[PDB]
């Protein structure tokens, strides 16, 4: 299952669909509709379409209706009649969407064409979000996308993470179980494979390819720091050099300057960094300072 988990097929991709709708059946937790004119305007549009023309000059003050935006993913090779999941998010001053029902909503693409029609019952968790829900199989595909799959004798596998070693390894793995010249790497992120002419032939070839297992090679040393959530993650290839670290309210347990032992593997790094007795908030600053000095032999990314 390595090749499918590492790469993606060229032309097999997911698009994004968006639309506007109304959610009805709320228990008095909808829009105020005095500060969100589009809710009442679109309700009047729906009624006018259905055969009820409410007078232009009138005051409608609803409480069970909310104006929402619906987002979905158009899956690869989607055919009309299939169903997809949608996400429903409130748009103006609505308290909750607990037990609402999404009315008929056309999901447009980037090209402003309807690719799906959405309508269903929203499932809201019930510290849980109240203005956001999900409808499983809530939208039906109405339009299909032409594709070039099955045409030509080349298929590109696109690596999720760029690596010359991994690209070469996938090339050598495809060229071991599937013939001599069945794959050629084009760059650090693309492996071009030669496929038989046809549609089912390429499907069979890619089915074979996808479940093959490749031995993942060492992949860069990096320390990911998320300051907004206060988390630090170090992969296996992170090392350290011997150097001294000082920080506020931290001391040898006896001065404030603690020596960090050079470290070869990740267990040594973890032990050396835990010897400092540093909170992760302090550990982030320690890692940044060590990266500046040169003790930390890894790529420090702040996400």
């Amino acid at each position: 299952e390595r090749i499918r988990d590492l790469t993606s097929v060229q032309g097999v991709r997911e698009n994004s669909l968006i639309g506007y709708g109304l959610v009805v059946g709320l228990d008095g937790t909808g829009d105020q509709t005095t500060q969100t004119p589009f809710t009442t305007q679109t309700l009047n549009n729906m009624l006018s379409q259905l055969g009820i023309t409410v007078p232009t000059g009138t005051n409608m003050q609803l409480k069970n209706v909310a104006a929402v935006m619906v987002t979905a993913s158009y899956p690869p090779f989607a055919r009309q009649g299939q169903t997809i999941d949608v996400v429903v998010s409130s748009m103006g001053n609505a308290k909750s969407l607990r037990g609402g029902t999404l009315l008929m909503t056309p999901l447009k693409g980037v090209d402003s064409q309807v690719y799906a029609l959405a309508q269903g019952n929203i499932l809201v968790g019930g510290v849980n979000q109240l203005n956001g829900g999900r409808i499983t199989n809530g939208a039906i595909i109405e339009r299909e996308l032409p594709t070039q799959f099955g045409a030509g004798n080349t298929i590109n596998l696109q690596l999720n993470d760029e690596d010359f070693t991994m690209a070469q390894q996938i090339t050598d793995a495809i060229n071991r179980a599937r013939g001599y010249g069945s794959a050629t790497a084009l760059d650090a992120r693309t492996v071009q494979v030669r496929v038989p002419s046809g549609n089912s032939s390429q499907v069979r070839f890619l089915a074979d390819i996808q479940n093959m297992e490749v031995n993942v090679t060492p992949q860069d040393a990096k320390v990911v720091i998320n300051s907004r959530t206060g988390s630090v993650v170090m992969n296996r290839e992170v090392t350290l050099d011997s150097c001294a670290v000082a920080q506020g309210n931290l001391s040898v347990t006896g001065g404030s300057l603690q020596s960090v032992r050079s470290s070869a593997n990740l267990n040594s790094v973890v032990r050396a960094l835990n010897a400092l007795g540093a909170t992760p908030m302090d550990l982030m600053s320690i890692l940044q300072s060590m990266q500046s000095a040169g003790c930390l032999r890894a790529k420090l990314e702040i996400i």
Binding site: N15, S16, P76, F77, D111, L145, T147, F149
Partner: protein
């Protein structure tokens, strides 16, 4: 004297017909961008 042919100030055509757009490529994407400037 008002019948003398004259050349207007804004010469040329005062309208432009929208040009039909390129046919989308068969890459499996909904977003299709014309020849980018």
């Amino acid at each position: 004297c008002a019948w003398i042919p004259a050349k207007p100030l804004v010469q040329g055509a005062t309208t432009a017909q929208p040009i039909p757009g390129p046919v989308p490529v068969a890459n499996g994407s909904i977003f299709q961008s014309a020849q980018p400037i």
